[PDB]
Design a protein around this nucleic acid. Structure first.
Ligand SMILES: [K+]
Ligand SMILES: [K+]
Ligand SMILES: [K+]
Ligand SMILES: [K+]
Ligand SMILES: [K+]
Ligand SMILES: [K+]
Ligand SMILES: [K+]
Ligand SMILES: [K+]
Ligand SMILES: [K+]
Ligand SMILES: [K+]
Ligand SMILES: [K+]
Ligand SMILES: [Mg+2]
Ligand SMILES: [Mg+2]
Ligand SMILES: [Mg+2]
Ligand SMILES: [Mg+2]
Ligand SMILES: [Mg+2]
Ligand SMILES: [Mg+2]
Ligand SMILES: [Mg+2]
Ligand SMILES: [Mg+2]
Ligand SMILES: [Mg+2]
Ligand SMILES: [Mg+2]
Ligand SMILES: [Zn+2]
Lengths: 82, 205, 153, 60, 96, 114, 127
RNA sequence: UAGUUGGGCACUCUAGCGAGACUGCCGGUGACAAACCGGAGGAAGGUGGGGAUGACGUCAAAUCAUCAUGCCCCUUAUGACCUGGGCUACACACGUGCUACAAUGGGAAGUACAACGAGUCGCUAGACCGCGAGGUCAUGCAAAUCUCUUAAAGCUUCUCUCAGUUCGGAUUGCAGGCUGCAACUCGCCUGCAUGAAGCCGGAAUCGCUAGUAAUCGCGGAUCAGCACGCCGCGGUGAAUACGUUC
């Protein structure tokens, strides 16, 4: 995976939006197109609406999701069976 | 079926490269400067019977030899026209250009000029059979060992395209020692592209 | 081919037994041009035969060939709506071809773990006129005898 | 959508990996040689004309 | 002096190589060569058709012929003599 | 026998240990080198001192039921959080980007030609 | 006195020198048995001596490179036959009738474009 | 210690210029012919082997996305910019491959032999760190000089002993390494763990006539990264062709 030296990756525009809200009694949804961004522990408690190609899917970030990309929780293809 | 390009087949056997330069790191740069040089000259001198451009590169210089059946037109009065050509090429190439005009003797034996001539006539609504026959006459009178010509497309506006060609003498496309000149020229008509192919067989090498 | 019979390339004799037949056997057992492995199998098996028997292994192998090489073969012939087999005498070159092919093919199907053991056992059995390779020869003669009515063809 | 594609390729890439090679003669994106900056089609076409120095049909 | 000549055609290459030897030798210097070096070859394989038809190809090659000249105990005239002599554009030349 | 598994008695120790879930070829070599048991001895020849040393060595590692619960918990987590991988696990499809138009028979099971 | 011979086989080139001796063959500073560990290939190398009845008369110092052990073995066999030709010109007939003087011109056939190998073609499906 | 250094290019090799095969020589057959059969010499013999080279045409065969172009259509749009997604979706059917189903093998150790090629911010020696992928300092080379590149089959010993296995390596968990702004959808590689089908494949069907098939690796184009594909290279190296009814 991504080299340990490089550290974990998150887009600064997304990281800024979460940082602006950390000290918030009531959080609000963060609309993002950054599927590539890693879920940091600071994301826990937020709902990040992730673009899946056509819409923003609201994903609630539980502490069990840390380390996974935001895109892992916004499937791009719809398949209900043949 | 399909046939190898008559010139591409003999390049490196009896025909030499037109791009007469060597390079390793600037090969890509030099090659595509040649294409811009050749393209520019084909526009500037479209009225002169310009057939072969040979490009030689010596350090920052670019020596260009232009073969023309109308050298007087290309040069102009007192070198006015060629001098205007070096400046335009200097600007285009970005370096020093020397232009050498070469007289094409026997233009009737030069495939590109013959093909271009036939192409111009077809644009004038000249009978395609007539245009090829009189090109064949001139080439044979000039002493060609043989000539072969072909015109393809919507001949005389026919709805169904077809190819009509004529030949005279010998055109041995498989003989590798034969000096066979080839050219493909397009005539744009009211009905679309007409393809003119000319093969001229000169003294074998 | 249509033009006619072709040249058959000669094989050089075995280095240690000085027999072309041994070289032909090595080629038959060979797989993927790995002649070193093929030669080792044949030479190990001739040493096994030199152990289970006191006789020259080359002699035992030649006796196995005598019992395995067929004499009459069936040549399929399509006549009209009926396709029947015609007995045919086997030319000497094909005789050794069939013998080598049968001895090797049935050795590969034997039960012993290693090929040289399987080959030595198959050779010795054939030298005694028993085993699968001999049974292939018996069936081939049996088929020709049954179809002996088509000899005139 | 050729001309816009040709123009956009000419401009500097926003990210380094996004820079790609097109045929300088015709703009073909696929099968572009680095030595000649030409696609396989233009390369074969110009090699026949004898306008690519040093190149000739290979046989052995 | 070590002179490496490279060209796509050996006919001009020999002609220019001889000129280096003739001028350099005539001016009193003693020359080694010309030494043939392995001609380089690069192979390009292109699909012959513009669309599909993968099995039909055409092979193109570029051959770089090369020579080596070593001038030993060169005279002072060599430096200018081997520089007044201008080689055809097709023949590449490096000195030392 | 060692970790609740009757390891093959006829085989050499390096291989017999591999029959323990969580011990592969490399791990078996490591535990034998640590205990000091030759790799070529059949386990039928292992003395109670050697066997107990192996058991002590193996008890350090996570094997058998402990390993199986560990891995199943990982997959359980992927499904619970609703990740893309978890859905792949739950729907029986390749989880590591493999194409499914063809193949994928290991995950999908036997072909249903219907 | 030494007798020189060049032998070639596939891409192997063997420079062979004969000197009167014990039949010893050394190849690239290593004896024939170590360098060519195949018994049948070493028998190939000694074919020229057998046909010319010079077994045991001559030592062989071989400087060979390129190709493989079988190719080098055939190259050495070619070099000895040529070197043995300098020993006594009248060995020509015996060496010739054995095919030892012939340079085996069989080389690897080039891969063809469109074919997986020189002759092997891609598997074909009518429909 | 080293073709190392001196010395020499002799041999090899590199490459220009040449020599050589031409039914030319000899016997036989043949219509005083063409030609065929055999022979000698020769490295090579009858086109020596292979390649390039593809007649007039055929299938209104393929390509209006390489390019070009008649006519038609769109023009605040069918043009143009962007981020994300898709082209990699999977109850299924087929084509082409790769790896297997083992002992002519698997594993470990030791030892040998190529060729075509590629390389400047590229190929990278050597040393050190890491189980490894690789990292680090650093070296030579724009190169028959340095490097990629000590090729794998192979050979010699040890081991395993017929077992769905020490065969097979799919799948999955975890941990890493790289390239990249980024590898979740969609990358390649590594370690540990996991250890699926598969016991040689129905009807049917494919390639190949020798340095070929079979098998073994190696290089290259595209390319930041990424092929079991493609192109090329050499190693090892067979079986068979009676014959022309189908
Ligand atoms: K490209
Ligand atoms: K996929
Ligand atoms: K498939
Ligand atoms: K159009
Ligand atoms: K178009
Ligand atoms: K494949
Ligand atoms: K298949
Ligand atoms: K073994
Ligand atoms: K990816
Ligand atoms: K099969
Ligand atoms: K690559
Ligand atoms: Mg790219
Ligand atoms: Mg194909
Ligand atoms: Mg285990
Ligand atoms: Mg994939
Ligand atoms: Mg059509
Ligand atoms: Mg259009
Ligand atoms: Mg696709
Ligand atoms: Mg089994
Ligand atoms: Mg054939
Ligand atoms: Mg090969
Ligand atoms: Zn192009």
């Amino acid at each position: 995976g991504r080299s340990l030296k490089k550290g974990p990756f998150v887009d600064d525009h997304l990281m800024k939006k979460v940082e602006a809200q950390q000290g918030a009694e009531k959080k609000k949804v963060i609309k993002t197109w950054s599927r590539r961004s890693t879920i940091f522990p600071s994301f826990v408690g937020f709902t990040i609406a992730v673009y899946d190609g056509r819409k923003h899917v609201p994903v609630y970030i539980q502490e069990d999701m840390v380390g996974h990309k935001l895109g892992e929780f916004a499937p791009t293809r719809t398949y209900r069976g043949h | 079926g399909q046939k190898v390009h008559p010139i591409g087949m003999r390049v490196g056997i009896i025909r030499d490269w037109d791009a007469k330069w060597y390079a390793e790191k600037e090969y890509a740069e030099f090659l595509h400067e040649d294409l811009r040089i050749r393209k520019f000259i084909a526009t500037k001198l479209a009225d002169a019977a310009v057939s072969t451009i040979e490009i030689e590169r010596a350090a920052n210089r670019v020596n260009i030899s232009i073969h023309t059946a109308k050298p007087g037109m290309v040069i102009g009065k007192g070198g006015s026209e060629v001098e205007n050509l070096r400046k335009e090429l200097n600007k285009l190439t970005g370096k020093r250009v020397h232009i050498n005009i070469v007289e094409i003797k026997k233009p009737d034996l030069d495939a590109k000029l013959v093909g271009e001539g036939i192409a111009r006539q077809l644009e004038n609504r000249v009978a395609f059979r007539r245009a090829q026959k009189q090109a064949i006459q001139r080439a044979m009178r000039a002493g060609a060992k043989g000539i072969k010509t072909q015109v393809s497309g919507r001949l005389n506006g026919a709805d169904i395209a077809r190819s009509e060609g004529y030949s005279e003498g010998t055109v041995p496309l498989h003989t590798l020692r034969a000096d066979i000149d080839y050219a493909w020229e397009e005539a744009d008509t009211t009905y679309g592209k007409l393809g003119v192919k000319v093969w001229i067989y000169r003294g074998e090498i | 081919p249509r033009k006619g019979p072709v040249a058959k390339r000669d094989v050089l004799p075995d280095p240690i037994y000085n027999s072309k037949l041994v070289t032909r056997l090595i080629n038959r057992v060979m797989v993927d041009g790995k002649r070193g492995i093929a030669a080792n199998i044949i030479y190990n098996s001739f040493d096994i035969i030199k152990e289970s028997t006191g006789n020259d292994p080359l002699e035992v192998f030649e006796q196995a060939m005598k019992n395995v090489m067929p004499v009459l073969e069936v040549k399929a012939r399509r006549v009209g709506g009926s396709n029947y087999q015609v007995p045919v005498e086997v030319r000497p070159e094909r005789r050794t071809t069939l013998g080598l092919r049968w001895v090797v093919n049935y050795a590969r199907l034997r039960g012993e773990h290693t090929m040289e053991e399987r080959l030595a056992k198959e050779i010795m059995d054939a030298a005694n006129n028993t085993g699968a390779s001999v049974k292939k020869r018996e069936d081939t003669h049996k088929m020709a005898d049954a179809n002996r009515a088509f000899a005139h063809y | 959508a050729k001309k816009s594609m040709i123009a956009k390729n000419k401009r500097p890439a926003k990210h380094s990996t996004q820079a790609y090679t097109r045929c300088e003669r015709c703009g073909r994106p696929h099968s572009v040689y680095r030595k000649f900056h030409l696609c396989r089609i233009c390369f074969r076409e110009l090699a026949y004309k004898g306008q690519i120095p040093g190149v000739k049909k290979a046989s052995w | 002096i070590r002179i490496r000549l490279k060209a796509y055609e050996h006919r001009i290459l020999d002609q220019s190589a001889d000129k280096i030897v003739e001028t350099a030798k005539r001016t009193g210097a003693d020359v080694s060569g010309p030494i043939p070096l392995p001609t380089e070859r690069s192979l390009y394989t292109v699909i012959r058709a513009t669309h599909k038809y993968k099995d039909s190809r055409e092979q193109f090659e570029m051959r770089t012929h090369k020579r080596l000249i070593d001038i030993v105990n060169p005279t002072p005239k060599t430096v200018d003599a081997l520089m007044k002599l201008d080689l055809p554009s097709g023949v590449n030349i490096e000195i030392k | 026998r060692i970790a609740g598994v009757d390891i093959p008695r006829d085989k050499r120790v390096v291989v017999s240990l591999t029959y323990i879930y969580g011990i592969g070829n490399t791990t078996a070599k490591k535990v034998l080198a640590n205990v000091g048991v030759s790799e070529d001895v059949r386990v039928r020849d292992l003395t109670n001192e050697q066997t107990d040393a192996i058991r002590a060595e193996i008890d350090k590692l996570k094997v058998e039921g402990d390993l199986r619960r560990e891995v199943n918990l990982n997959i359980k987590r992927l499904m619970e959080i609703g990740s893309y991988r978890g859905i792949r696990h739950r729907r029986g499809l390749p989880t590591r980007g493999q194409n499914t138009k063809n193949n994928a028979r290991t995950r999908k099971g036997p072909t249903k030609t219907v | 006195v030494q007798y020189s011979g060049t032998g070639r086989r596939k891409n192997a080139v063997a420079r062979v020198r004969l000197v009167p001796g014990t039949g010893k063959i050394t190849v690239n500073k290593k004896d024939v048995e170590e360098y060519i560990p195949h018994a049948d290939l070493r028998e190939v190398i000694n074919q020229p001596f057998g046909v010319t009845e010079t077994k045991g008369a001559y030592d062989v110092i071989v400087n060979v490179n390129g190709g493989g052990y079988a190719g080098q073995s055939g190259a050495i066999r070619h070099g000895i036959a040529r070197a043995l030709l300098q020993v006594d010109p009248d060995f020509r007939s015996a060496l010739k009738r054995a095919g030892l003087l012939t340079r085996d011109a069989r080389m690897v056939e080039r891969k063809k474009p469109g074919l997986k190998k020189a002759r092997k073609a891609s598997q074909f499906s009518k429909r």
